[PDB]
Amino acid sequence: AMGSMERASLIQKAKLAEQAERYEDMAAFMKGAVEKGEELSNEERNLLSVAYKNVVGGQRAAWRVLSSIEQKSNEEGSEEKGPEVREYREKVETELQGVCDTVLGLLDSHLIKEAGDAESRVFYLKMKGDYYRYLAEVATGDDKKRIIDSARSAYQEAMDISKKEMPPTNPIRLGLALNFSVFHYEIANSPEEAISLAKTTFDEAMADLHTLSEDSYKDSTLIMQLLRDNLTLWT
Amino acid sequence: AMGSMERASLIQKAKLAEQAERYEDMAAFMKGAVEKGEELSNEERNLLSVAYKNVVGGQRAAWRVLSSIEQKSNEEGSEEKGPEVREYREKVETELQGVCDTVLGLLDSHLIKEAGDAESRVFYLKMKGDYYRYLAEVATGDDKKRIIDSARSAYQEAMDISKKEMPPTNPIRLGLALNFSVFHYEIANSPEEAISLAKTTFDEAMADLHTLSEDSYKDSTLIMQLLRDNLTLWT
Amino acid sequence: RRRKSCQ
Amino acid sequence: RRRKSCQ
Ligand SMILES: CN(CCS)C(=O)c1ccccc1
Ligand SMILES: CN(CCS)C(=O)c1ccccc1
Ligand SMILES: [Cl-]
Ligand SMILES: [Cl-]
Ligand SMILES: [Mg+2]
Ligand SMILES: [Mg+2]
Ligand SMILES: [Mg+2]
Ligand SMILES: [Mg+2]
Ligand SMILES: [Mg+2]
Ligand SMILES: [Mg+2]
Numbered sequence: 001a002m003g004s005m006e007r008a009s010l011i012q013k014a015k016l017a018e019q020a021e022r023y024e025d026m027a028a029f030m031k032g033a034v035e036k037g038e039e040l041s042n043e044e045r046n047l048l049s050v051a052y053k054n055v056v057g058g059q060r061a062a063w064r065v066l067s068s069i070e071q072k073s074n075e076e077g078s079e080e081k082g083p084e085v086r087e088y089r090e091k092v093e094t095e096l097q098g099v100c101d102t103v104l105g106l107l108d109s110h111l112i113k114e115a116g117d118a119e120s121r122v123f124y125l126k127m128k129g130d131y132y133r134y135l136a137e138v139a140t141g142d143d144k145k146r147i148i149d150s151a152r153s154a155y156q157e158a159m160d161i162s163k164k165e166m167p168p169t170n171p172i173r174l175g176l177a178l179n180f181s182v183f184h185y186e187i188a189n190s191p192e193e194a195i196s197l198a199k200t201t202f203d204e205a206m207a208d209l210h211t212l213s214e215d216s217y218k219d220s221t222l223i224m225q226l227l228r229d230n231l232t233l234w235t
Numbered sequence: 236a237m238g239s240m241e242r243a244s245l246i247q248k249a250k251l252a253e254q255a256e257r258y259e260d261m262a263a264f265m266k267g268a269v270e271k272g273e274e275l276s277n278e279e280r281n282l283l284s285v286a287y288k289n290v291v292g293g294q295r296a297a298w299r300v301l302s303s304i305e306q307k308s309n310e311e312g313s314e315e316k317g318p319e320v321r322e323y324r325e326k327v328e329t330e331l332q333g334v335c336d337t338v339l340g341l342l343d344s345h346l347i348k349e350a351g352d353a354e355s356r357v358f359y360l361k362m363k364g365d366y367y368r369y370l371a372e373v374a375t376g377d378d379k380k381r382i383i384d385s386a387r388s389a390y391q392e393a394m395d396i397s398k399k400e401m402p403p404t405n406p407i408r409l410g411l412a413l414n415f416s417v418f419h420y421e422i423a424n425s426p427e428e429a430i431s432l433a434k435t436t437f438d439e440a441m442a443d444l445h446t447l448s449e450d451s452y453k454d455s456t457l458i459m460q461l462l463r464d465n466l467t468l469w470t
Numbered sequence: 471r472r473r474k475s476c477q
Numbered sequence: 478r479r480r481k482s483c484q
Contacts, residue, residue: 012319016304020297022327053484062255069251084247092257130482175483182482226481233480288477365475410476417475461474468473 002032010036014047023054027099034106039114045123052103056134059096063138066092093138100131107131118165119172125158126176129183136187148187155180168204169212174223177201178230185234195234202227237267245271249282258289262334269341274349280358287338291369294331298373301327328373335366342366353400354407360393361411364418371422383422390415403439404447409458412436413465420469430469437462 002010010033017026030048034040040048066089072078073085107128115121132151139147159180162173177197185194205224209217237245245268252261265283269275275283301324307313308320342363350356367386374382394415397408412432420429440459444452 009317009319012316013323016301016320016323019304020300020327021293022297025323025326057484058256062257065255066251069254081247082244084244085251088248088251088260091260092255126483178481178483182480185480223483226483229481233478292477361476413474413476417473420473458476461476464474468471 002028002035005032007033007036007038011044011047014051018047018050023051023058027051027055031102031106034111037110039120040111042119045120048106049123049127052099052131056096056099056103056131059092059099060134060137063089063092063096096138097135100135103131104128118161122158122162122166122172122176125154125161126172126179129155129158129176130179133179133183133187151183151187155183167208167211168201169208169216169220171219171223174201174205174220174227178223178226181227181230185230191234195231198227198231198234202231237263237270240267242268242271242273246279246282249286253282253285258286258293262286262290266337266341269346272345274355275346277354280355283341284358284362287334287366291331291334291338291366294327294334295369295372298324298327298331331373332370335370338366339363353396357393357397357401357407357411360389360396361407361414364390364393364411365414368414368418368422386418386422390418402443402446403436404443404451404455406454406458409436409440409455409462413458413461416462416465420465426469430466433462433466433469437466 005013010029014026014029014033017023017029026047030044030051033044034048066085070085070089073081107124112121112124112128115124129151132147132154136144136147136151155176158176162170162176166173178201181194181197181201183194184190184197202224205220209220212220240248245264249261249264249268252258252264261282265279265286268279269283301320305320305324308316342359347356347359347363350359364386367382367389371379371382371386390411393411397405397411401408413436416429416432416436418429419425419432437459440455444455447455
């Protein structure tokens with residue numbers, strides 16, 4: 001639907017949509033920009049991520065509300081209210097899966113294969129792990145283990161690159177470690193791995209802060225605090 | 236699209252959508268329920284109003300953000316950035332107008348004509364004034380005066396009924412007066428009428444509070460405080 | 471401070 | 478308190 005709009009206009013409108021908190025529009029504009037076939041700059045990758053994280057975040061929050069109602073509906077002593085709660089949870093779930101499949105499709109056609117620099121490749125592989133993680137959050141069937149393994153594999157490739165090619169304070173590296181640690185805790189039933197990863201990431205970043213400017217220090221310490229927040233919650 | 240779903244299931248799902256903060260879904264479910272052709276109960280009217288107020292409220296907020304950017308873009312000394320800001324403001328505006336036209340269409344086919352009790356009739360005529368008011372907020376052309384007059388006329392009919400048939404503390408009557416006062420202030424360039432209406436509404440409600448239960452007192456005083464907030468802002 | 475309408 | 482991920 002965005003094929004007739006200039007790439008630069010799509011990027012401009014994505015930024016306007018962000019200012020207006022119109023994240024569905026923002027995501028549609030950024031999808032259009034990706035489909036122009038050119039690589040994304042750092043700023044453009046961030047716009048893509050912000051847009052879809054906000055869209056799926058709303059869907060995930062709604063899914064959790066509905067899933068909890070459905071759970072309570074199926075306890076002993078609860079009254080049969082019909083198929084409606086399940087139907088509506090399924091509707092939201094299918095829409096969420098559709099957004100995840102769209103993002104994964106953009107990554108596969110063809111953002112990842114053209115991404116050669118560590119900053120872009122790690123960013124996109126992190127995103128791939130994230131959207132498989134969101135699929136795993138709602139999965140229950142024959143392919144659930146395979147969805148979890150797809151998330152794990154993308155995160156692991158991103159980790160391997162990030163450790164070789166980025167400093168331990170790099171914000172992308174830090175955010176990847178944060179999210180892979182959440183994957184371990186919440187998805188893979190591996191709380192010890194989650195804690196170990198968060199701790200080693202935090203400690204290795206702390207030791208590298210001395211190399212940074214004031215502005216980079218602020219960026220890195222912000223994400224380190226998210227790691228610390230999880231460690232405090234989990235221990 | 237909701238023609239195959241039971242009325243009761245649409246109402247149930249509207250309530251689930253509210254809990255999940257999925258207001259677009261909530262509005263679609265309530266539109267489906269209205270289109271079943273039966274009158275709405277008090278609770279169902281409130282669900283319809285909540286759903287569409289939240290949808291259009293998001294659109295209005297986005298329109299104001301974009302309109303302000305467009306304004307700044309057209310000041311002296313600003314740099315030509317192309318048609319994109321105007322285009323995107325127009326896109327949001329058209330979507331907003333579409334929602335208003337949908338609500339007005341439900342009211343006209345056939346909620347108002349079947350509404351005989353004061354509580355339903357005043358409620359729907361207030362809604363008609365509100366959605367014409369939202370159309371007036373974005374109007375600039377040959378029909379703008381006619382849109383403003385349509386809002387005025389609906390509000391005035393609702394006021395006439397409410398004064399004859401409802402006590403001065405009735406929450407629907409109070410909310411109608413609040414919104415008609417905003418219409419006067421913001422739309423009709425009549426700040427004195429807006430202030431006079433808010434003041435007389437507040438004072439007449441205050442004199443009737445003695446008749447109310449604790450719970451009704453809480454309901455009425457909440458809306459009276461909104462009138463007071465506007466009077467404090469405007470004087 | 472934005473004026474109030476009936477929400 | 479909900480755990481943090483990268484927002
Ligand atoms: C509390 N409250 C909303 C603020 S006025 C109402 O009672 C109401 C009145 C008219 C229409 C819809 C809602
Ligand atoms: C601050 N912040 C988000 C919290 S980790 C980032 O810098 C980022 C890192 C990776 C991917 C997207 C954003
Ligand atoms: Cl449904
Ligand atoms: Cl547009
Ligand atoms: Mg399903
Ligand atoms: Mg390349
Ligand atoms: Mg490097
Ligand atoms: Mg227009
Ligand atoms: Mg009737
Ligand atoms: Mg009466």
